[PDB]
Amino acid sequence: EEFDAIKIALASPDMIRSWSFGEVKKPETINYRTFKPERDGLFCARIFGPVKDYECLCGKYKRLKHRGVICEKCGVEVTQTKVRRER
Amino acid sequence: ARYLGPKLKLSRREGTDLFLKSGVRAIDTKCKIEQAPGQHGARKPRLSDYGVQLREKQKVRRIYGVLERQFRNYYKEAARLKGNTGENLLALLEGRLDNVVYRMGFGATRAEARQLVSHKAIMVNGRVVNIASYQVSPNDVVSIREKAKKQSRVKAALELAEQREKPTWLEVDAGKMEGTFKRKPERSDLSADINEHLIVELYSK
Amino acid sequence: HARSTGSYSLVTQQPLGGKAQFGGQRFGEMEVWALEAYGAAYTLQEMLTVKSDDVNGRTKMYKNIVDGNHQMEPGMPESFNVLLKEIRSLGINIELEDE
Amino acid sequence: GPEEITADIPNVGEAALSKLDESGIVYIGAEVTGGDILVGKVTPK
Amino acid sequence: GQKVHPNGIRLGIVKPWNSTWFANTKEFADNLDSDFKVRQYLTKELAKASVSRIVIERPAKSIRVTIHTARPGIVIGKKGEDVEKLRKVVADIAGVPAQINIAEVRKPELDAKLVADSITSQLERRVMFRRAMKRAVQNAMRLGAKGIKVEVSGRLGGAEIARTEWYREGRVPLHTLRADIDYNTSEAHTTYGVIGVKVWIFKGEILGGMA
Amino acid sequence: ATVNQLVRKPRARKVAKSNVPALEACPQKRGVCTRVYTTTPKKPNSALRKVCRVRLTNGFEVTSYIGGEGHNLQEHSVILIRGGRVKDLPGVRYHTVRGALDCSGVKDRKQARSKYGVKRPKA
Amino acid sequence: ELQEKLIAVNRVSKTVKGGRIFSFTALTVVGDGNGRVGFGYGKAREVPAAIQKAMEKARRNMINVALNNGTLQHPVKGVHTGSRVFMQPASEGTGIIAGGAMRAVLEVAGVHNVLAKAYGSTNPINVVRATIDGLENMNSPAMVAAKRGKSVEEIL
Amino acid sequence: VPLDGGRFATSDLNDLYRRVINRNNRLKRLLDLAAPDIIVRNEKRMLQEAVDALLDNGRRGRAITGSNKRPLKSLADMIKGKQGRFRQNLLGKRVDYSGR
RNA sequence: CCCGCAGAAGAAGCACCGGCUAACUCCGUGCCAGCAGCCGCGGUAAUACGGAGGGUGCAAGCGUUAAUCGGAAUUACUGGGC
RNA sequence: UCAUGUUCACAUACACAUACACAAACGGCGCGCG
Ligand SMILES: [Mg+2]
Ligand SMILES: [Mg+2]
Ligand SMILES: [Mg+2]
Ligand SMILES: [Mg+2]
Ligand SMILES: [Mg+2]
Ligand SMILES: [Mg+2]
Ligand SMILES: [Mg+2]
Ligand SMILES: [Mg+2]
Ligand SMILES: [Mg+2]
Ligand SMILES: [Mg+2]
Ligand SMILES: [Mg+2]
Ligand SMILES: [Zn+2]
């Protein structure tokens, strides 16, 4: 995004919810044998976004044709994994 | 009227996991899932087009436990209902009562859900339904009766349903052993891999 | 030691540092005052974005150099977007603004 | 699963493997340069 | 039509012999027998070392094996142990003191016998013969051979009728006696019989005629 | 063709005849083998296939083929016949039903027993 | 990006002094999936080289078809050597309910709703050329209103 | 990130959020199970004293640690000063096409 | 129709596997015996005959034959040609 | 001028090489160089 000034302020609770894509619930990150992110933990692919480059976690979709579908095996959105750092 | 053979066999034949076992134990540990069934399994002869249509049909039918006559009847009902034939077919199949039971988790596998619905543990709006293929309509309060509400397997399946990711169009309270059907599932609310068009054109050959 | 291109760090996409890793030299704080003390603005813009941090611009730059076009598209560094989120991860709403 | 050391490395031909012995370790007295495989480890799956 | 063995017809002109010694009619046959036995046992031992070419040379007091292969590491191991053991075994076979010298070939893709062993191994592990041949041709050409021509023959892919398939990439002139044509042949012993493999590799027309 | 000509003499679809007239649109008919014999096929095949000149109930006399490996029939025998041509016995447009009045059961058939009228062995 | 699929791989022959020289011909169709399609017909001694030559020829000489939202603009008939084709626009959700090669071409062109039929011969080559003809000679409201000199709302 | 074999790098913040979320899970429990004032004042103190860690560890009475008294780096320790973004990665940064 | 009774206890076949057509290997046999909806298979290594194992498809049925329509723009009014 | 030739009988969609794309990271503690 192009810009030409910067502003800072306190974030009201509804603004903070607005930045959210999900609400974290479990005190966990990734499994300790396999290494999938444990869902609703601090890495859950459906809160933040998919781990694999442009393909989903539940395995159901693996091609740009499905770009932006949300599955119903685990609930992840298939999208750019780049956005996993954005949300 | 039912498939009584090995289940992981079907899973291997399809290739995918069809969820025919509870998923306590990994399928790789129970079998060589990466291999077609039988002596001559290890081979992928370039599948014919109708062949892949057939394979998709078999995948869905053996995920849900529906014999082909009933499945063709479902196909015809979908052709009747207006809208998109594929989403309509998925709507009917999901609306199957044994499927709703498995969904609300009162059964480790859809086989167990059919078993309990057959042995009269399932009641829709206080009326005990004995046919597994009953068509649950929207906003139906489907409950479990007491006699099999003591069932240890029932409670363990409640826990394993809490393990699974929960469907969005079903409101099931485990303590009260009571689910409620609210809205017909969306295509996006079902698994995504299944392609409507394959089954559609297969039966509209 | 010398580096054309290679690794980048994960948290922010700036290059790794080392010989034991194929690293890029730090154009550290004092060097930036040194450029600012010449008039040199475009050199600096490059040095701390296109050559460094802008995840788009560096791949567009590379291709423009192999094409020999000698032109850059400078964008905005992703380490600065890291900062915004690390502030916005406090209850401090910092945001970019338009006019 | 468990790793192996081998010459049977996938995706590489004798052009590189010529300096390994048959076990999967370089010969003593091999003279080596960047990118030579010294030890042909492999991982399952 | 039936072809002339290229290395054979080029002997003396371009290529050098494998064996090199002089011995009169009393010694000759026994020399040849010992050499045949040592080559037999040597190949059988170093089936995996990628042994391109042996060279026997007995200067009337000993035998000198000079073995061009691509895996000195594999044939030697730690500090020539396999080397010296093979040497003593060769000495017992031949009946004279022995000596081994190992030469390392740089491009395993350009030696005919090496390519032959590779294609034969692929076929024994039941890969698609067409794909094997194509990949071999690509490897040789990309390495930079001025020409290469490969041919597999017999029961290709388990068919009942045998036939000969072959590829040529680039130029491989045979009638030019001053062209360095490497040639070799091999046999893949599959469950349907032997599948033959021939490989010509034209490396350049060397005009002086060294050795 | 002009609409006018079609008016004067309409189009009367081609009539596809019966491929099995002696059955008279009836799935099977009874017969009484007048003569059981063997005939050689037509090129390129070679065999000695078993056929019976058979007298239908309605009076037609056809040549029926005797399927399966081995038969125990003879003349004066009551058989049941169904449709379908052999092909390599040109002029034979009927099969005999196996496991019928006199057309006995085959021996030691373990596949297609329903095709060949053989009992379900000890199972 | 161009979604491409073959249709038919036939083995043709040429008799020469010794015996018969076999050769394969693969007829493939490519298309971007948004409305630009193109077919190619390659021949070589081997199936892979044949298919690859076909696909090169097809990736060149593609055409535009005036598309309306995954269906055609008006019932169109096309004729080539032996095949005759009837392609009718269809409602939403119908599917690509058509023959084999017709399905291939319409699908890579992107059309998801179309009623088709292949009267006369069914030779995949002629049927594909006839399908491409029938897709080309289809004009959209923009085209026809430009051609008569009116608005898109006057012709509708 | 995983390191040398099957071990995750101790990635500090994920230990701080882990503190928070554990405390919050307990506090939702003990609220809905309706604990008495003294118990909830315990967990509510421990939660406020944990979010304290996550924001600016060590402005508390003591910085919290997970090793031989190494204080875990919290968010505000990532922003500020000589190892934090403003000096370490924004104002001057490593660059490609360089050598020494 | 409801309630209670003990017991997995009382309940699975049929066709097909050369291509069209989903799904293969071994053995028996040797243009014989045989199969076959069409093309074809069988003459000493039968993925096509017979048996086995394996698999595929339908399932209280499955297959075979008979019959009509469609496919057949193959009586072409819609919609053929000389 | 110059006839005839027993029967049957002859390789087919590229579903990859130890699906495409994918090359080492973060903090102390030290020593040393400037
Ligand atoms: Mg007739
Ligand atoms: Mg098949
Ligand atoms: Mg049969
Ligand atoms: Mg046999
Ligand atoms: Mg057959
Ligand atoms: Mg058989
Ligand atoms: Mg029934
Ligand atoms: Mg008609
Ligand atoms: Mg006509
Ligand atoms: Mg005569
Ligand atoms: Mg003749
Ligand atoms: Zn998914």
PDB file of N, CA and C in Angstrom, chain B residues 90-123:
ATOM      1  N   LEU B  90     -24.952 -34.076  -3.066  1.00  0.00           N
ATOM      2  CA  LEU B  90     -24.246 -34.057  -1.790  1.00  0.00           C
ATOM      3  C   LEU B  90     -25.200 -33.745  -0.646  1.00  0.00           C
ATOM      4  N   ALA B  91     -26.163 -32.855  -0.884  1.00  0.00           N
ATOM      5  CA  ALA B  91     -27.146 -32.529   0.140  1.00  0.00           C
ATOM      6  C   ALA B  91     -27.905 -33.769   0.578  1.00  0.00           C
ATOM      7  N   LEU B  92     -28.453 -34.512  -0.382  1.00  0.00           N
ATOM      8  CA  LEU B  92     -29.195 -35.726  -0.042  1.00  0.00           C
ATOM      9  C   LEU B  92     -28.316 -36.709   0.726  1.00  0.00           C
ATOM     10  N   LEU B  93     -27.143 -37.018   0.166  1.00  0.00           N
ATOM     11  CA  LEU B  93     -26.273 -38.011   0.783  1.00  0.00           C
ATOM     12  C   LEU B  93     -25.913 -37.619   2.206  1.00  0.00           C
ATOM     13  N   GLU B  94     -25.564 -36.353   2.427  1.00  0.00           N
ATOM     14  CA  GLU B  94     -25.238 -35.920   3.777  1.00  0.00           C
ATOM     15  C   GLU B  94     -26.460 -35.999   4.680  1.00  0.00           C
ATOM     16  N   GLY B  95     -27.632 -35.652   4.152  1.00  0.00           N
ATOM     17  CA  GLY B  95     -28.842 -35.674   4.945  1.00  0.00           C
ATOM     18  C   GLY B  95     -29.273 -37.052   5.377  1.00  0.00           C
ATOM     19  N   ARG B  96     -28.704 -38.104   4.786  1.00  0.00           N
ATOM     20  CA  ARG B  96     -28.873 -39.448   5.340  1.00  0.00           C
ATOM     21  C   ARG B  96     -28.732 -39.441   6.860  1.00  0.00           C
ATOM     22  N   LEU B  97     -29.608 -40.192   7.533  1.00  0.00           N
ATOM     23  CA  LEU B  97     -29.664 -40.131   8.991  1.00  0.00           C
ATOM     24  C   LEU B  97     -28.448 -40.780   9.633  1.00  0.00           C
ATOM     25  N   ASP B  98     -27.995 -41.917   9.107  1.00  0.00           N
ATOM     26  CA  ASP B  98     -26.784 -42.516   9.653  1.00  0.00           C
ATOM     27  C   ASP B  98     -25.615 -41.554   9.528  1.00  0.00           C
ATOM     28  N   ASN B  99     -25.584 -40.788   8.441  1.00  0.00           N
ATOM     29  CA  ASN B  99     -24.534 -39.796   8.280  1.00  0.00           C
ATOM     30  C   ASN B  99     -24.681 -38.681   9.299  1.00  0.00           C
ATOM     31  N   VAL B 100     -25.911 -38.247   9.573  1.00  0.00           N
ATOM     32  CA  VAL B 100     -26.097 -37.203  10.579  1.00  0.00           C
ATOM     33  C   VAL B 100     -25.651 -37.700  11.947  1.00  0.00           C
ATOM     34  N   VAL B 101     -25.920 -38.969  12.245  1.00  0.00           N
ATOM     35  CA  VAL B 101     -25.491 -39.543  13.518  1.00  0.00           C
ATOM     36  C   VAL B 101     -23.974 -39.560  13.608  1.00  0.00           C
ATOM     37  N   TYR B 102     -23.315 -40.124  12.594  1.00  0.00           N
ATOM     38  CA  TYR B 102     -21.858 -40.112  12.576  1.00  0.00           C
ATOM     39  C   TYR B 102     -21.329 -38.698  12.713  1.00  0.00           C
ATOM     40  N   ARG B 103     -22.008 -37.738  12.090  1.00  0.00           N
ATOM     41  CA  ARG B 103     -21.551 -36.357  12.109  1.00  0.00           C
ATOM     42  C   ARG B 103     -21.591 -35.800  13.521  1.00  0.00           C
ATOM     43  N   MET B 104     -22.741 -35.922  14.182  1.00  0.00           N
ATOM     44  CA  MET B 104     -22.854 -35.529  15.580  1.00  0.00           C
ATOM     45  C   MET B 104     -22.020 -36.415  16.496  1.00  0.00           C
ATOM     46  N   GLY B 105     -21.402 -37.458  15.960  1.00  0.00           N
ATOM     47  CA  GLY B 105     -20.378 -38.187  16.667  1.00  0.00           C
ATOM     48  C   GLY B 105     -20.841 -39.350  17.504  1.00  0.00           C
ATOM     49  N   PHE B 106     -22.111 -39.736  17.418  1.00  0.00           N
ATOM     50  CA  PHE B 106     -22.586 -40.850  18.225  1.00  0.00           C
ATOM     51  C   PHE B 106     -22.241 -42.174  17.563  1.00  0.00           C
ATOM     52  N   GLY B 107     -20.984 -42.341  17.169  1.00  0.00           N
ATOM     53  CA  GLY B 107     -20.534 -43.570  16.549  1.00  0.00           C
ATOM     54  C   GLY B 107     -19.138 -43.430  15.983  1.00  0.00           C
ATOM     55  N   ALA B 108     -18.265 -44.399  16.261  1.00  0.00           N
ATOM     56  CA  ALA B 108     -16.874 -44.273  15.845  1.00  0.00           C
ATOM     57  C   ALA B 108     -16.770 -44.162  14.333  1.00  0.00           C
ATOM     58  N   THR B 109     -17.486 -45.018  13.621  1.00  0.00           N
ATOM     59  CA  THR B 109     -17.506 -45.010  12.171  1.00  0.00           C
ATOM     60  C   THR B 109     -18.948 -44.947  11.705  1.00  0.00           C
ATOM     61  N   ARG B 110     -19.129 -44.588  10.435  1.00  0.00           N
ATOM     62  CA  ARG B 110     -20.473 -44.597   9.876  1.00  0.00           C
ATOM     63  C   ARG B 110     -21.088 -45.983   9.959  1.00  0.00           C
ATOM     64  N   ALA B 111     -20.258 -47.027   9.966  1.00  0.00           N
ATOM     65  CA  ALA B 111     -20.773 -48.371  10.188  1.00  0.00           C
ATOM     66  C   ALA B 111     -21.389 -48.494  11.576  1.00  0.00           C
ATOM     67  N   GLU B 112     -20.697 -47.991  12.601  1.00  0.00           N
ATOM     68  CA  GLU B 112     -21.259 -48.036  13.947  1.00  0.00           C
ATOM     69  C   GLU B 112     -22.508 -47.172  14.052  1.00  0.00           C
ATOM     70  N   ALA B 113     -22.512 -46.021  13.379  1.00  0.00           N
ATOM     71  CA  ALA B 113     -23.691 -45.165  13.408  1.00  0.00           C
ATOM     72  C   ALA B 113     -24.885 -45.874  12.787  1.00  0.00           C
ATOM     73  N   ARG B 114     -24.675 -46.535  11.649  1.00  0.00           N
ATOM     74  CA  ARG B 114     -25.733 -47.352  11.071  1.00  0.00           C
ATOM     75  C   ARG B 114     -26.132 -48.473  12.019  1.00  0.00           C
ATOM     76  N   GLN B 115     -25.164 -49.049  12.731  1.00  0.00           N
ATOM     77  CA  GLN B 115     -25.472 -50.142  13.644  1.00  0.00           C
ATOM     78  C   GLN B 115     -26.408 -49.681  14.747  1.00  0.00           C
ATOM     79  N   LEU B 116     -26.105 -48.541  15.354  1.00  0.00           N
ATOM     80  CA  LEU B 116     -26.928 -48.077  16.462  1.00  0.00           C
ATOM     81  C   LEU B 116     -28.284 -47.577  15.965  1.00  0.00           C
ATOM     82  N   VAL B 117     -28.314 -46.902  14.809  1.00  0.00           N
ATOM     83  CA  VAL B 117     -29.593 -46.480  14.245  1.00  0.00           C
ATOM     84  C   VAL B 117     -30.443 -47.689  13.894  1.00  0.00           C
ATOM     85  N   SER B 118     -29.809 -48.791  13.497  1.00  0.00           N
ATOM     86  CA  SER B 118     -30.551 -50.003  13.186  1.00  0.00           C
ATOM     87  C   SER B 118     -31.059 -50.672  14.452  1.00  0.00           C
ATOM     88  N   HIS B 119     -30.231 -50.715  15.491  1.00  0.00           N
ATOM     89  CA  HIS B 119     -30.620 -51.293  16.766  1.00  0.00           C
ATOM     90  C   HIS B 119     -31.334 -50.294  17.659  1.00  0.00           C
ATOM     91  N   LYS B 120     -31.885 -49.232  17.072  1.00  0.00           N
ATOM     92  CA  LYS B 120     -32.832 -48.346  17.744  1.00  0.00           C
ATOM     93  C   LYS B 120     -32.199 -47.692  18.974  1.00  0.00           C
ATOM     94  N   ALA B 121     -31.214 -46.849  18.690  1.00  0.00           N
ATOM     95  CA  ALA B 121     -30.687 -45.926  19.676  1.00  0.00           C
ATOM     96  C   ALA B 121     -30.892 -44.473  19.287  1.00  0.00           C
ATOM     97  N   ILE B 122     -31.505 -44.207  18.142  1.00  0.00           N
ATOM     98  CA  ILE B 122     -31.586 -42.866  17.584  1.00  0.00           C
ATOM     99  C   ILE B 122     -33.047 -42.471  17.470  1.00  0.00           C
ATOM    100  N   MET B 123     -33.371 -41.273  17.948  1.00  0.00           N
ATOM    101  CA  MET B 123     -34.723 -40.745  17.894  1.00  0.00           C
ATOM    102  C   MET B 123     -34.675 -39.335  17.335  1.00  0.00           C
TER     103      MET B 123
END
